[PDB]
From a paper:
[name] Hjm (PfuHjm) is a structure-specific [name] that was originally identified by in vitro screening for Holliday junction migration activity.
We obtained the two different PfuHjm crystals (Forms 1 and 2) in the nucleotide free-state, and determined their structures at 2.4 Å (Form 1) and 2.0 Å (Form 2) resolutions, respectively. In the Form 1 crystal, the C-terminal 60 residues, about two thirds of the C-terminal domain, are missing in the final model, presumably because of structural disorder. The structures of the two apo-forms are quite similar, with a root-mean square deviation (rmsd) of 1.05 Å for the corresponding 651 Cα atoms. The Form1 crystals were obtained using ammonium sulfate as a precipitant, and it was found that five sulfate ions were bound to the protein. Notably, all of the sulfate ions lie on possible DNA binding surfaces. Collectively, these results indicate that the sulfate/phosphate ions mimic DNA backbone phosphates. Two point mutations (R306A or R309A) in PfuHjm significantly decreased the DNA binding ability (Fujikane and Ishino, unpublished data). However, the C-terminal segment was invisible in both the Form 1 and Form 2 crystals, suggesting that this segment is highly mobile.
Numbering used by the authors: 1 to 331, 336 to 556, 564 to 664
């Protein structure tokens, strides 16, 4: 299909041409002629390499232009939002307002009412709906990217919830990877189903086993070692992407590869890779990233700061970096994609990476511009080669299961309905359930109903809600406030129960430990080695905490380690020193800090709700200290367009 055969305003055809696009891939055309341009819902299940995002932009803009209103683009993580924001800029050339909303859960954000295209994570949008933002009624279409994450135990329930709220109120467009139950999800969505595996560049998938790669077609190719695939790819001017399961693993493998890749890097690239390694902020975690990069290979994982990760990502794109070793969470295309591990550590033991995931990983092979073929190789270190092939190259992807039973999401969601959506009867809350994907999969209805009755009891006991002998459920201040803060009802419960202790002794350690013990935060882990030190410091500072005795406990000390880290953060300990002293990386530090700000904020708000107004100012000063990791006497110099503990501290001196 030629962009000009597209029955849409010239403004869109014009913007695409400027983009170099003149025609659509067969999968794109099928999607564009399925009814999405006429408002129908649709579920697009095709390779990422086939431009799922373009089908969404076109249907969004066409939607707005033909009927005013706004378009919502829901993104998986508040990090794939800035990239969606950059690529959605060219829509402003035709007068479209593109906004990005990610955090700050406690606000209606009425300022978004003047934008046409809004990008947000599922959580952020879920809370906007709770706050009842004025403009939401103007949303005419919502696009959910990687909609298949609805099957994620963690946050899939949130995505399901907002989708359940929006179905039949706006056009819904889902973008997903291949899954086992495409038609079931499409039906629940009352959507057109577009399933395809057509891709621009041919994809050859194989398995590397003891000196050889066996491709799906049947042929065999010798390779002395899996790493040789990388080396070969690099010698051939192409690049390589290698997936691993652990951070340190990614780090060991990156440094390793780089030790033999450097002898393939012309003077320019080595010269450049050095100007590159020297630009990295200084800290342990980067020192490593440094050595590897000067060698041409880099590692990529959550333990690295946002910037570092961006620097890697783009330079791999720029091609200045020949290969990047990365973990899954937070993972451009490459000629060769190597999956070096097929077993990952879960709390359920070491398990095999899901099929849906391996496919998504192999699908990143083959750059439209530079390749006549893309190759994805799974490395079988100690698995039956044939079994690996049959399970990951010829096995149906997993079927998506509603993750609505996730007790933490459900408890927070049952209250949200009562406290911000006016549900007042169990039977009415059940009506909501009936429109969810859980209800549509006809999954165990009884068990869900009982978990909800129990949850209502929990909420009724802790005074978030109230009931009548007529059984009319109505929310109370703490209920409404909790729901609007987006925190788990249980962390609110934990704040409420300890509010007397906090006002009796307001202090950093106590608070950080308290918040780091709730469900809304993932405390730092600790090893067998340091645990010794943690115990002494604990018993040395048990007076400042708000809990009697851990025993009378793993999370307790994780939270306690976290309380110490944050404490050093507010006391301006240099990043690098914190990384060292507590064995933690700047990625987790920024993540935890950012979450602590949110959580110390929510404690202030819950304090307001419970009369403890005398600690409000303190917690407020604590919130700001946590956000920038600074002493109070610097909070003024924080205003600036940008500075931080960085210069600020020096300035003040």
């Amino acid at each position: 299909m030629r962009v000009d055969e597209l029955r849409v305003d010239e403004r869109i055809k014009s913007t695409l041409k400027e983009r170099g696009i003149e025609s659509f891939y067969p999968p794109q055309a099928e999607a564009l002629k399925s009814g999405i341009l006429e408002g129908k819902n649709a579920l697009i299940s095709i390779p990422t390499a086939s431009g799922k995002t373009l089908i969404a932009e076109i249907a969004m803009v066409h939607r707005i232009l033909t009927q005013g209103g706004k378009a919502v683009y829901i993104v998986p993580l508040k990090a794939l939002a800035e990239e969606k924001f950059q690529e959605f800029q060219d829509w402003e050339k035709i007068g479209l307002r593109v906004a990005m909303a990610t955090g700050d859960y406690d606000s209606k954000d009425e300022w978004l009412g003047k934008y046409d295209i809004i990008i947000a994570t599922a959580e952020k949008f879920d809370s906007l709906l709770r706050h009842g933002s004025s403009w939401i009624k103007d949303v005419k279409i919502l696009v959910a990217d990687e909609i298949h994450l609805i099957g994620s135990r963690d946050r899939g329930a949130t995505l399901e919830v907002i989708l359940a709220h929006m179905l039949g109120k706006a056009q819904i467009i889902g973008l997903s990877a291949t899954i086992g139950n495409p038609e079931e999800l499409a039906e629940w969505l009352n959507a057109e189903l577009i399933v395809s595996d057509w891709r621009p560049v041919k994809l050859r998938r194989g398995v590397f086993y003891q000196g050889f790669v066996t491709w799906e077609d049947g042929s065999i190719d010798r390779f002395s070692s899996w790493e040789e695939l990388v080396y070969d790819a690099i010698r051939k001017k192409k690049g390589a992407l290698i997936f691993v399961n652990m951070r340190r693993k990614a780090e060991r493998v990156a440094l390793e590869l780089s030790k033999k890749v450097k002898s393939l890097l012309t003077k320019p690239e080595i010269r450049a890779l050095n100007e590159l390694a020297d630009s990295l902020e200084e800290n342990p975690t980067n020192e490593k990233l440094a050595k590897a990069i000067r060698g041409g290979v880099a590692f990529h994982h959550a333990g690295l700061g946002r910037d570092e990760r961006v620097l890697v990502e783009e330079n791999f794109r720029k091609g200045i970096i020949k290969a990047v070793v990365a973990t899954p969470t937070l993972s451009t295309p490459a000629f060769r994609v190597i999956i070096r591990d097929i077993w990952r550590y879960s709390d359920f033991g070491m398990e095999r990476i899901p099929i849906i995931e391996v496919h998504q990983m192999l699908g990143r092979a083959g750059r439209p511009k530079y390749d006549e073929v893309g190759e994805g190789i799974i490395v079988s270190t100690s698995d039956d080669p044939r079994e690996v092939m049959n399970h990951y190259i010829f096995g149906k992807p997993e079927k998506l299961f509603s993750q609505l039973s996730n007790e933490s999401n459900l408890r927070s969601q049952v209250l949200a309905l009562i406290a911000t959506f006016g549900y007042s009867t169990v039977e009415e809350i059940l009506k909501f359930i009936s429109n969810t994907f859980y209800a549509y999969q006809r999954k165990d209805t009884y068990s869900l109903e009982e978990k909800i009755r129990n949850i209502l009891y929990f909420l009724l006991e802790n005074e978030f809600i109230e009931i009548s002998l007529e059984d009319k459920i109505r929310p109370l201040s703490l209920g409404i406030r909790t729901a609007k803060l987006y925190i788990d009802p249980y962390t609110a419960k934990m704040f409420k129960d300890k509010m007397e202790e906090v006002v009796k002794d307001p202090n950093p350690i106590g608070i950080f430990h308290l918040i780091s013990l709730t469900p809304d935060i993932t405390p730092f882990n600790y090893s067998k080695r340091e645990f010794e030190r943690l115990e002494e410091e604990y018993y040395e500072f048990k007076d400042r905490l708000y809990f009697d005795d851990p025993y009378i406990e793993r999370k307790f000390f994780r939270a306690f380690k976290t309380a110490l880290v944050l404490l050093a953060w507010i006391n301006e300990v240099p990043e690098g020193e914190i990384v060292e002293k507590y064995s933690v990386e700047p990625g987790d530090i920024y993540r935890i800090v950012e979450t602590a700000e949110w959580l110390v904020y929510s404690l202030k708000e819950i304090a307001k709700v419970l009369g403890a107004y005398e600690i409000v100012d303190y917690l407020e000063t604590l919130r700001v200290r946590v956000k920038y990791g600074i002493r109070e006497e610097l909070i003024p110099l924080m205003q600036l367009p940008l500075v931080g503990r960085r210069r600020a501290r020096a300035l003040y001196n």
